[PDB]
Structure 1
């Protein structure tokens, strides 16, 4: 019957899940979006359970949070993709249906004037100031293996204080000085708007986060359903995701409207 689509609680997740729901519905499936079902592992366990049949995950997240693989020497796009696609399949029967075409990385962002004034443009530079800095995390970055724990492993420091909040509130919080550092999402143009400087990950702590549609094993045997999903393969580059996200967060357009209008524009619907 219905193909239920999971989502983590932020812009592109609501947009992409809705975009997949409209496509599936144009091709004769009933679809339902569970917006903001929970974080990565709540969604992944839902997926395993078949409470949802697919959602949009990221290679680095799959690699580190879901599969708990050990970080390699150097992060390599293709290596992480292949290890994720093999590891999801072999471990849980989960299938990468599609690579959407964009990357949505975690990247440490500070207020741009603050880093102008203090001579800071890499993460290893934050070491001198970390004990003075308030980190405003999204719901996951603080505790997950590739987050603050990885910053401590590689860079050797931790922050004065850590606050946790919904992902979309990070941007306001660092604009309004309630926090001083955030794990910004690189597909969020509020990084440019609010005059933040994403810092260089100079020791290569963080993996690439390439966006993928993942589908549970049983849903993936439906070859039609998979071919509908592949209509989105390499269809949204990073710039396009940023612009679509901009529409949602800044211009406050509805997620579904954004998705439908993208899909009309691409010749995929109507």
Structure 2
């Protein structure tokens, strides 16, 4: 009896796909449940609305994104990642009755990024330094980063930056910065393209960006129905360095390895999955 099947969705990129396959591998080995991974399912609002609607069951959400985008009104949080997790976990349970499991170790932040040659040429070390050259350089940003208070709106409001911005599809912005259509983009800190393309990350000197650590987000009612999901997925909690996650993103995203295979090999190596 009772092989219930779980929809596990990613945001856009190798990393949510890798994390979703990690959830699927853990759930299938350790529970009576199957999982289906939905790669590139959405951006943050679509995953969040789909999770509330029951059109998906689990996706990885990140701690500053719960506080900054999902919680309304957004709370004023410290820059300590542990405190930022507890605010995100308690807030989203209160607001929406989502259960937000314990975060992994690594942070994947938004990172205002330029070519290394561009930072050398224009004296750019911090995000404040872009105010020197905000009429000399063009940015390409993801639409959600433009849409987000901790994104380009934060670049305006906290930094006073009015960048010349083209909106980009997320899968195209790294190639645009690498080819030279743009000179600034909203990198993600564990993205393999940062090292691959010799991008240098501008320092967040006013600290616009909160901590972002990933964790499973699910409805409380699913976790009431399947309380073993908490023990099983919290295997990942406090685990996976930034350097480990970047290499997994390289394996899927750059070497074109399948995300289930990269996920399963990592968890086996890490002692978290069989064989």
TM-score by length of 2: 0.93
SS at 2:206 equivalent: coil
Aligned to 2:252: 248
RMSD: 1.5
For residue 76 of structure 1, report the CA deviation from its aligned partner: 2.8
**Preserved contact between residue 59 and residue 84 of structure 1 (Cα < 8 Å):** yes
Aligned to 1:191: 194
Aligned to 2:139: 135
Instruction: Please give the alpha-carbon distance, in whole angstroms, between the structure 2 residues aligned to 1:260 and 1:73.
Output: 35
Runs (4 or more) in structure 1 with deviation over 2 Å come to 68-76
Instruction: Please give the alpha-carbon distance, in whole angstroms, between the structure 1 residues aligned to 2:182 and 2:92.
Output: 36
Aligned to 1:26: 29
Aligned to 1:211: 214
**More deviation, 113-122/258-267:** 258-267
**Preserved contact between residue 74 and residue 204 of structure 1 (Cα < 8 Å):** no
Aligned to 1:114: 118
**Preserved contact between residue 9 and residue 17 of structure 2 (Cα < 8 Å):** no
**Residue 50 of structure 1 is aligned with which of 54, 68, 85?**
54
For residue 69 of structure 1, report the CA deviation from its aligned partner: 4.1
> Counterparts of 1:1-270 in structure 2 under 5 Å?
1-27=4-30, 28-70=32-74, 72=76, 75-166=79-170, 168-221=171-224, 222-267=226-271, 268-270=273-275
Aligned length: 269
TM-score by length of 1: 0.95
For residue 219 of structure 1, report the CA deviation from its aligned partner: 1.0
Instruction: Please give the alpha-carbon distance, in whole angstroms, between the structure 2 residues aligned to 1:227 and 1:79.
Output: 22
Instruction: Please give the alpha-carbon distance, in whole angstroms, between the structure 2 residues aligned to 1:230 and 1:74.
Output: 24
Instruction: Please give the alpha-carbon distance, in whole angstroms, between the structure 2 residues aligned to 1:263 and 1:81.
Output: 24
**Preserved contact between residue 134 and residue 159 of structure 1 (Cα < 8 Å):** yes
What do the CA deviations read for 1:91-122 (whole angstroms, capped 9, x no partner)? 11111123122110001001110110121111
**Preserved contact between residue 141 and residue 165 of structure 2 (Cα < 8 Å):** no
For residue 236 of structure 1, report the CA deviation from its aligned partner: 1.0
For residue 225 of structure 1, report the CA deviation from its aligned partner: 1.9
Instruction: Please give the alpha-carbon distance, in whole angstroms, between the structure 2 residues aligned to 1:188 and 1:254.
Output: 17
For residue 264 of structure 1, report the CA deviation from its aligned partner: 2.0
Gaps of 5+ in 2: none
Instruction: Please give the alpha-carbon distance, in whole angstroms, between the structure 2 residues aligned to 1:207 and 1:118.
Output: 27
Instruction: Please give the alpha-carbon distance, in whole angstroms, between the structure 2 residues aligned to 1:73 and 1:237.
Output: 23
For residue 70 of structure 1, report the CA deviation from its aligned partner: 4.0
Gaps of 5+ in 1: none
**Preserved contact between residue 150 and residue 209 of structure 2 (Cα < 8 Å):** yes
For residue 79 of structure 1, report the CA deviation from its aligned partner: 2.6
**Preserved contact between residue 78 and residue 84 of structure 2 (Cα < 8 Å):** no
For residue 74 of structure 1, report the CA deviation from its aligned partner: 5.0
